[PDB]
Structure formats: C-alpha cells, structure tokens
Ligand binder design. Structure first.
Ligand SMILES: [Ca+2]
Ligand SMILES: [Ca+2]
Ligand SMILES: [Zn+2]
Ligand SMILES: [Zn+2]
Ligand SMILES: [Zn+2]
Ligand SMILES: [Zn+2]
Ligand SMILES: [Zn+2]
Ligand SMILES: [Zn+2]
Lengths: 254, 254, 254, 254, 254, 254
C-alpha cells in the first residue's frame, strides 16, 4: 500500500476548500457529515466531548468518503499530537498558538526524529496501516499538514514571527476566542474585530501561508472567500441540528 | 417519590402533540433534540441502530426536559417490551400490528400479572427508580401508554378489530411501510394511499382512540392536524441533519 | 489448558451456596461484587440493562475471583443461549419455564449435536478460549449447568413434569413473578404464597433436583436455608446501593 | 449518490472469492483485516460477541477498503435481518436453514414490499445514506445478496427444495455444525463427512447456485477451490491471533 | 432558555450541604445516587476511572434530579477545565492547590476572556445547550463555582494567600492526601491531623470562604457540621456498595 | 485480602521474562493474548488508542491469568500515573526518560506521601480493591515496579545518572525511537545502533538494574537474551494479526 495522499494539504496552494465543523462526537454522525461533499471536516477535540478513541471512530467513518479529515486537539500538547498522528490524522489544527517558539515545537511534534520529536511506533499505528504501508517511516512527514490558530492578543503580537516558521502550512483565525480576547465576547461582527481579521488574513497570504477561518454567517464566509482565504468552515453540525429542529417546530408551535 | 406522570398519555385526550423522530442513536444527540420543545420524541429501536442500553442512555438524556419519550421496539417482542418498560419507557409504539389477537398480546405485555404478562423485577428497574418509587407495582400500569402501528394490508384488514381492543391507547399510521404494502413504495403522496390514510384516521378517532402519523411534508402534516390527528411527528433528526448540511454547502459549492 | 470446572454445578450436591444478584450491568460494578466472597453472582440479562457484550465484560471481571457466575437470559431463546454459552457462561438461569417440553428444549439448547442443538463455533468462543482448551468440544457439555425458573401458575401446573426432565440441574422459584401470578403482586410474604413456595422447594428436593430462590428478607432467606434449599440469593446490588446511600443520608437530613 | 454496487454478489458468477472470518467483534480489528486484501470478510453475529451497533462500527471500518462485507446474524430472525440491512449490510449469511419455506421467508426478509417483508425506513438508514442515495427504495433489492447455511441433517434432507428457491444466491456449508449433526463433532476431516460435503457442493453448483464453505485447513480449502466452490473462507481472525502468538512464544519458552 | 442556576454556589452562603462521592464512573450508577436526595454529588475524575465522555454521561443522568453536580478533574489542568465546563459542569473541585498563583490561574481557567482564559466554543457546548441559552456568553461566569483542595504541607503553607484569592468560592480539605502528607498515611483520625483540620476550617470561614471536607466517619462528619463547615461529603458510593454487600454476606457465612 | 504480589518485579532478579506487546486496545483481544502464557503483557497507552478506561478493561481481562500486566502511559505525566496506579497497574513503563531528575520524579509519582507524591484515594481504587485489601496504604509501595525507557540521545547522555536513581527497577531500550534519534529511522538493525544497544544493556546490568527491550526479530531477541537481558518483548499483537492474515491470503491469491 502507498501512504494516504493529503489532498487537503495539496489544495492549500490550488483552491479554496469549504469545511464543516464536526462536534457531534460520534462515528455515526461523522459519517452523515461525510456524505454531504464538504472539502474538509474538522473533528473537534477541543470544544466537543471527544477523546483519542472517539476521534479514531470518526476517522474510520470519514475514511470511505472524499472529505478530508482535520483534527483539533484540546491544546498544543506534544504527547496528544503523537497519539492523534498514530491513529492516522494527517492534518492538525492547534488552538491558541501565541509564539514562533510554540509554532516551531508544533512543527517538531508532527515530524519524526531526528528532525522532529514525533514518537515512533509504526507497527501499532493505523497511520502506517500497521506497517502495511511498507515505507511509512520515510514517506509520513510529506503528507502531514500543520495548521495553527491565532486567536489571542499574544498570537496577533507574534503573527509576523509565526508566519516565518517553516512547516506551519496554515494559520486559522478563531473569531469566537479572538472577539472575546479583544473585549467583544459573543460579537465578532463588530468592525474593530472584522478590521483585525481582514488585515490578519492579508498578512497570512502575503507571507505565502494558507489563511483559514470559521463563520456560520453566510455573508461573512463569502467575504472571506472573496479575500482569497484558502480554508473556510461555513457551519457547525450541532448548530445546524439544533436550528433545523427549532425552525421545523416553529411551523407548528410557538 | 411518586411514579412519573405520563403527560403524553393524558394529552391524547386534550391536545394535538407535535413529535420529532430520534434516529441518531446517541444520548448526546437525543439531548440536543430534547432542548427544542417538541411535545414528544420517538426513540427509534426499529429503524435506527439502537439497543436497550443505547435507549436507556437517551431516556436519561431526555428525562431532564419536558419532551415526552416514546420508544419503538424492533418488533412486538414480549421479552424486549419487558426490557424497555423496566429501563423506564412509559409509552411504546409497536410496529406492524396486524390483528386484535396481536394487539391484545401487546396490552398484556405492558401490564403486570395477574391481568398481564409483564415480568416483575422492580428492585432492578430504573422504571421504579430501584423501588425509590415505593408503590410502583401498584401505580405502574396506570402511566403506561400502548400505541400500535397499522401499516400493512393485513393491519387495515383487521382495523375495526384492533380499534375494539381495550388498552390500545392509539393507532399510528406508518406511511412508508403502508405505501410500500399498497404497491406505491417511496410514493405515499399518491391519492390512492392518502385516501386510505384519511379514512383510517377518521375510523381511529370514531372509535375513541388517538390517531398518529409521521410526515416530514409540512403540507401533509398540517392537513393531518386539521383532521384532528392527536400525535403527529413532523420530522426526523437524521433527515434534518443531512438536509441542513447539504442546503448550507449548496450556498458555496455545486 | 483444561475446561474451567463448574464448581457451582458440583456444589448443588454438596453444600448450600449463597448468591448476590448483579444488576448494575457494568464490568467495574461486577468486579466490586466479585471481591465480597459470595458463592455465586447472578448476572441479570432479564431485569437489568445487559446485552451479550456487557455480560461478557462482567464474566471477564468475575473470572479472576472464586465467585461462580450464573447468567439469566431475557427469555428461553435458543439463539441467545448459544451466544451466552460461547462467551463462556457455564450456568444459565432460564426465566418463566412452564412445561417439560420447554425444559427439554432448554436442555438441548445447552448441549452440542448430535444429542443437543447448541451451535458449534469453538474457534471463535471465549468458552473454548479460542480452542486453547484443545478438547473443548468433547468436555464442554459436562461443565454446563441448566437451572429453570418456576414462577407462574402454568409452571406450578407442570412442576412434576419439569422435575422429571433429565438435564435440568435445578429449579429456582421467582417470588416476585410468582406472587404477582398468584394475585399478591408486591406481597410475596403472604402465607398463601409462602405455603406454595415451601411445598415447591420440598417437591424439587424430593425429585433429587437442586432448589433455589432469591429473598432480600434475611428471615425468609434463613428459613429457606433451614429447608435445605441448595442455592439462595440473599440480596441485589442495585437495592443495596440505593438502601445504603439512603440510610447514610437519613443520619444527616430528611 | 448511486447505491453501493455489491461486487460480492456479481463475482458469485465470475470468480472464486477468498474470505476471512472476522470474530474479533471490534471496528479497529475489522479495519486490520480489511487492509489484507481478502475478497470478502464475514462479520460474525452468530458466534462472536457482536450486536447491531458493533456490526455497524465494523461496516464503517471496512467501507474504506475493497474487501466486501458479509454479515451473519445469530439466526434467521426477520426483524434482526431488517436491522442489519438498514445499517447497510448488503450480503447476509443465514445460519441453520432447514427448509424451502424458511429459505423463501429469508428471501422476503431481504426485499421491500410489496414482493417482500423488509421494513421501510430509508430516511433513517445508513443503507440509503439517509436518502442521499435518492433512488434507494427502487435500486436497493438488486444489490442485496442472500446466502443460506446448510449444516444439519434436516438441511441436507431439504437441499433439492432449498436449491429451487429463487432469490437464494448461494448455499454455504458449515463443517463444524454439520460434522457435529452427523455424530463427528470436532472431526469434519472424516471421509463420511467429506463425501457428503463434496456431493453437496456438486449439487449446489449443478442447480446454478454459488457454493461456499469455511476451512482453516489449507489442503481442504484448496480441494474445495479445485471443485469450483465460489466463496471459500480460509481462516478465522481469533484463530490466527491465538496461533501466531503461541507459535512465537514456543521459539523462546516451553 | 435561561442559564441553569447554580444552587450549590448560592447555598454556600445560606446552608450546610450534604454530599455523596460518586466514583462508580457510570451514568446508570450516578442516576441511582441522584435519586437519594443528597445536596451535591461529586463526580470524581481524579480517583475514579472517568474521562470527559463518562463525566458527560453522569451529568446527563443527574440533570433530571435536584442534586447539584460537582466535578473533580484529575489535576488543575487549564485545557481539561475548559472541556469539563463546556460539557456543562458548573462547579469544579481542583485537587492539590498549593499557592495563590495556582488558585488565581484556576479562577481565570473558569472565566471567559477578556478577564479569564476559558476557551470560547458556545455553539458546541452542552453548557450553552448549543446556544439554546441565547445569552450564555454574558451569563455563564455568574453561575460557575470554583472550589480548591488544600491537602498538602505546601497548601497549608500558602493558606492565608489562597484565602485572599477573589473567585475562590470554597476550600475543601482532603483528609486522605493531607494525613499522608503529614506522615499519618491511612490515619487521618490522629489528633495531630484533626487539630490542623479544625484550625484550617476556622481560618477558611474567618476569611469569608466556604469550607468543605469528606469523612465517611459519621462522628467526624457531624463534628465538622457543628463547626459550621458549608459542604460536607459523608460517604463514597464504591465504599457503601462494598460494605453493604460484605455486611449482608456476614449474616450467612464467613 | 492481601495485596496482589508483583511477580514481574520479583522475577527481574531471578529469571528472564518473555513479553508480548498488546496494542489491540480492547479487553477481548487482551484476554486472547493472556491465554498464550507470556511472562508479561505490555498494555500500550503511548502508541495504541487506549485511555484509562480501556486500560482498566484490559487489566480486568488479564487479571484471571498468570501473565503479568505492565502499562505504558503516553508520557511521564504525574496525574496520569496516579490514575493508572489506582485502576491497579503495578508495573509502569515510562517513555522517553532523559534525566536523573525526571527519573526521580517518576519514582515519587509511584510512591505515597510523605516519601512520594502519589495521590491517595484507596476507598475508590481497584488497586486496593476498594479497601477490601485492608492494609493497602501500608503495603502498596512494595509491589509497585517502575521501568523507564532510554530511547533518545539525551537519555543516553544521562544514562549513568538514571542508573544511580534508587527506585528505578529497570531500564528498557526503545529501538524504534532510539534508531530514529540516531538518524537510522526504520533501520535499528544497523551496527552503529546495535553496538550502542549492547553497551547500554551491559551498563544497565553492571549497575544492578534490570535491562529490557522489544524486538520482533527472533535472531536479535535471542542475542539480547544471551546477553542476560531480564525482560524481552518478542512481538506485537497488531503485527502478528496483520502478518498471519497476509501470510494466509498469499497461499491462495497474489
Ligand atoms: Ca450493545
Ligand atoms: Ca474514553
Ligand atoms: Zn478558538
Ligand atoms: Zn413503519
Ligand atoms: Zn422472575
Ligand atoms: Zn455453523
Ligand atoms: Zn485528595
Ligand atoms: Zn519508544
């Protein structure tokens, strides 16, 4: 067998990829999302009740479908990154990255020694298909994609420095965490926040990195796509489930 | 503690109850549905991948919310009905009931001896809260609601007989199974099917029983409500999740 | 490896075995019960939310301890009996046995062809330790113990006939189901019920079968032991958990 | 989306398919087996500790790989067949089929009304991808494959009659159950059993049906392939795991 | 919907709350404990085999009952605190707090930016009911209660400093960890330990914070209540299960 | 009950122990491995998808068999070590230990205060059998075995210092991580690597500590045993499953 090609990583340079947030934390729900035709699915280990084993079930579900899986760990924890790479997550979104030093550590966390600090256990890993991918340890690093979140004042204070880190493929802006950090909690739509987001996207693309964002607002998501943003998540499964059920009930009952 | 009042059963005589089908087969998804404010939630053990233990998790989720739980077993199996009553399901929807004899057996399956054949294990049952409901074995039968599905030609051939069975609280029409039985598989909207559904609802209500149905078609659901149908399910969680995600993607990609 | 000796089965002829009902339906709770030193533990598949897989977890827990596991299936279902034997349950308690014909079918359900109808899959079975017990298909039947419940009027109406069935090792009286069948639901302590229970125990032992019963009443359990009853369950884990927590809270408030 | 083509069903007429028995009862173990390149994988619900939900997890695992999934239910139970078809199992192996009447009922159990008795719930089914396969209810029946086991004297007594049932695609011989039924329990290699197996394979192929069998004996499996047997399972995952670990330990320790 | 009122937090200033430790690590066991009527239930993520997902199941169980849930994480880990708040834990008990600097970090970990560092993901959180609590990001912080454990010499060495931290609602004394730290492991009943516990409770209440403790000794628990201790846990579910089963068996054998 | 004797720890001084890596991450697969007769089984929490709860299930499986369980946590995390000790793991293998200071911290993490920093919760712990081991807090430390991995250049740079740490019972060499650290990723068989491994084993034994290693290469494993290496793992369950299934298929298909 040949290593699974990371099409998400390749497409960061060739097209704009439309994403769905997956927080229903279940292999059955993830499979429903995988049937829709999103370019990417974010399996959220930070803000949904997921662990390594529930994330594996969702990778196994999504694997039969063209949608590319991206996993967000709860934090930039090097041992947890090791675990998520070994179950076969090829794209990671690291929350709350705030320095070049932390971004460089996240690069090393995704690469085998001697250049990186990714722990070696290919005989045990779904990532290598338990060594049925016979050249895994030489081909693995090429198909790993590292995305970091800038979503704090300290992150913005270190943006130029993070954008200079080789091996950071993309910077994702987190509008909920960023608007809260800026004193606009629950109000990312404010001009003060939006002006910072737009300038940040422009800086990311000017440094030759992919820019990413989530907005469940159709008009903001389309504006971000017009700016050239490479990976845009346009909704959240928990939100779509709750809203569709509320909208339906409102046709019959107040 | 006093036995949990079955408000669904009481409301069969006083109002029209709006329902949501729950086929996502998970405690977390059931809790999302419970937050919307449906009169009833149908936990589907027939057409969703549920078992006694996954149904218990969903009863526990939904129990904190005013929505009334109804459980559909995979078939009119007396031992499975015993299990679903003991985990605390107070309303059951039995699929594919086709005779007065089968409906009578379903009544006995829901009632303690000596009148019925419900197995007795109150010390072990969530239904009795492990005997913290101190009079459970005396008060249980009063709060149990039995619904049967008529959804085959043999069911329609025994309708008057089923409507004469004391202890059947409601007859639910299954349009998917019934349209297939009638040779209109996937097309319940045909006049031949709809004329049979309407006369069936009229006969059910004329015999003083509650009539029920599911339609994800808003216009058909409202027409059934205009006929006086007592329990109308208006949608399905799996369908609402798939459709909302597809509708969203279509704003950005073909 | 040699087949696991069924000590419960041997002790039916040599001592009186004290039992605990296990309805907490979890491997961790079953292990706590296994540490106490009961002669037997009844893993309840009838009145607790258990399935084959949760029953397997509890057999694996209990296997490291001297307590002997007995499994109660939800009914005398031949395919379910096959499944419970293959995960390695050596003693089964079949509920609601009501005829010699049903008791004979339960005997065949526990024995390999050509004498019985137990399905053969030793390569897959924990029962054979996946054929690490090399003579399993020759030695299995010897260590299987079949107990049947008499707990209905029809059961009592066929008692002499059931007691004549070779391969029935023991008859267990179910006081909750029997008192309900007799029109004393929730009141097994009535003299009318107790006189029937005592005569039934006497008839079972006079036919050379083991008699069994459950009573959470210390005085009745001790009377049943005085009669020579071979397997007496003296409590239920769910009841002991609820009662101990209530008794503790009562020291500090209402 | 178009319905998933059943390549296993097509290949019954074009080639000999090599199979692996999957009894490790887990989505992670099933994925390991799916990586090897077997033509088919038998997910065993009869002799491994599987239920509908654990079988779904294994279908989701195997779905990303070319290996074709076949599911064996615990028995020819029509409601359980409904459940396994709705989670998306396209090929079923029914154990212990003993008459044309039972085989015809198994055909109806796999087909929608009005010709069959398969329950209709396409909005909820992984089988229809929750109606993302838009013509599922008209295209489903064509991709369903029904296999029945002949593995008892009564089965052999009704072989000509079962081979005349339209909609039975294949007859699988179960050597463990059959050798036990013939009084050769644990000894299927006896000439008396082997002569019956060979004649049975010849009769199955002479009636224009696919013949199938399992043998972990390489020489018998190759003899069955030389006879033209269309679907041959050549091993069992639990057996291969136990034997490989024993063989390795024997190199170091007695 | 309005945010769930934290009654435990309110009652720290108005009454003495009686608590039960929940370490059976299961939604079904947590529901049994929720039926008893304790003021609070401690779901133990430190000393019971719990994770975020098992803690969510127990919050869902307990949510239908008046008992208030308190969650103990394994350590004062900021990302784990984020996860437990988002699944809807409103009261946290942080083990082994040893400085005002650590206590201040725990305060920030429970509060949204810009004042705190709690990660923002309200669309995904059971805590916001997936934004069905429409003002959650404005009202959340008010209903969060932070308790810290002092249970080491360094903790006692920083007690006055921790008691000066705004946002610490309560200090819980851990007698097992503290008696071990003091060189009286397994013997918290020693006068040297008890005199330190009593002075600590007095200092906590003198600084206007709630004091808490666990003792399964009725006499010590009642003495702590006489001192005015605001939150007293009086037992542990695992201990009550083991002890009740042992006490019962002792009536019938050694 | 008396504390469970750690025979693995005792045998470090008396024999050479043969081990199997267990990475199938399931109680059922662990039980299969437990039946073979390995001296020790390594439950891998670092490179297999395990968590505290899945590791508990595997300890419960393995506990009925003479094989000794060793648990590898994902990292030298003090709170995770606390959790794994409380579920009853008596031998721990800590990955990537790189200094005497870290090794000393790992010793304290495994010992109760006042000498160590192991959190005290014996009423809740399977390790104490919920205090059914009445002297657990006095006898626990004696039966705990700490193994550390040296598998990086920094580890080798601090080897003499680590070998001087009292309470380190054994040093395990990780050839996959070490060969990668040395610039021979996927090629531990190189003379440069093997000469370092051999001198490392010699230094470990010269300092009176047990030496350990894993090699799935029979010739290297036997050479390590000839050097006197005290604990040698000779294979990996995932590898043996994949290889045995591939070897079997190759007899029938290319
Ligand atoms: Ca199950
Ligand atoms: Ca978990
Ligand atoms: Zn964020
Ligand atoms: Zn229907
Ligand atoms: Zn009974
Ligand atoms: Zn068979
Ligand atoms: Zn403590
Ligand atoms: Zn390593």
């Amino acid at each position: 067998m040949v290593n699974t090609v990371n099409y998400f990583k390749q497409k960061l340079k060739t097209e704009q990829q439309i994403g769905m947030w997956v927080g229903l934390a279940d292999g059955y729900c993830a499979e429903i999302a995988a049937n829709v035709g999103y370019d990417w699915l974010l399996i959220d280990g930070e803000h949904a009740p997921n662990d390594v084993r529930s994330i594996l079930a969702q990778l196994q579900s999504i694997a039969a479908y063209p949608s590319q899986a991206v996993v967000r760990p709860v934090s930039g924890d090097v041992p947890l990154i090791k675990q998520l790479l070994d179950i076969g997550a090829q794209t990671l979104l690291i929350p709350m990255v705030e320095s070049a030093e932390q971004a460089e550590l996240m690069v090393k966390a995704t690469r085998y020694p001697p250049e990186g600090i990714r722990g070696v256990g290919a005989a045990l890993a779904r990532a290598s298909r338990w060594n049925n991918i016979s050249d895994y340890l030489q081909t693995a690093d090429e198909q790993i994609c590292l995305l970091v979140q800038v979503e704090s004042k300290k992150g913005l204070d270190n943006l130029d420095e993070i954008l200079n880190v080789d091996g950071v493929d993309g910077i994702f802006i987190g509008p909920a965490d960023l608007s809260a950090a800026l004193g606009y909690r629950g109000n990312p739509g404010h001009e003060f926040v939006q002006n910072i987001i737009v300038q940040t996207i422009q800086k990311i693309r000017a440094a030759g990195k992919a820019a990413g964002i989530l907005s469940a607002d159709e008009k903001l998501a389309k504006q971000y796509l017009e700016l050239g943003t490479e990976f845009v998540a346009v909704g959240v499964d928990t939100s779509l489930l709750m809203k569709s059920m509320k909208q339906l009930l409102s046709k019959f009952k107040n």
